[PDB]
Amino acid sequence: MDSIQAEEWYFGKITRRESERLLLNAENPRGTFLVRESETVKGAYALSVSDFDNAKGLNVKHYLIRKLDSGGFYITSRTQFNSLQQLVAYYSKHADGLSHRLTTVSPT
Ligand SMILES: N[C@@H](Cc1ccc(OP(=O)(O)O)cc1)C(=O)O
């Protein structure tokens, strides 16, 4: 499997604030996204996704991706993935509990 660093949507140690600055671009389709390290939960990841909310308008959603020491990743413990690549593919197809499905890799 490709290392996560080879994936166009993986931005590593980009901060939550830096991810919001990027994803709040009004040109980005709803569901523009990247994956990053979590700043608050060591060893976890975050899925950061451009959104349009009925009340808040343009906003960025952040979903915490937990990593099992035994192997695998999840946002909801009932729905586990063997890789971040599998997780991104799954949430690209359907929201299944996110605000919106993933549509667009954050441009850079
Ligand atoms: N519901 C939380 C879930 C969350 C928690 C932490 C997290 O990592 P970081 O602090 O790097 O954004 C990402 C998502 C949120 O909207 O922030």
Let me know how long the chain is: 108
84, 63, 73, 80: which is closest to 7 by C-alpha?
84
If you take atom 5 of ligand 1, which residue's CA is the nearest one? 64
Resolution (A): 1.6
DSSP 8-state code for residue 29: P
How do strand 104-105 and strand 73-76 relate by DSSP bridges? unpaired
Identify the experimental approach. Answer: X-ray
Nearest ligand 1 atom, CA 40: 10
Domains of the chain: 4-105 (3.30.505.10)
99, 1, 22, 19: which is closest to 53 by C-alpha?
99
Q: Which residues pair with 65 in a beta bridge?
A: 45
Nearest ligand 1 atom, CA 36: 11
CB 98 within 8 A of CB 49: yes
How do strand 32-37 and strand 104-105 relate by DSSP bridges? parallel
Residue that the structure tokens 């569901």 belong to: 31
Q: Which residues pair with 62 in a beta bridge?
A: 48
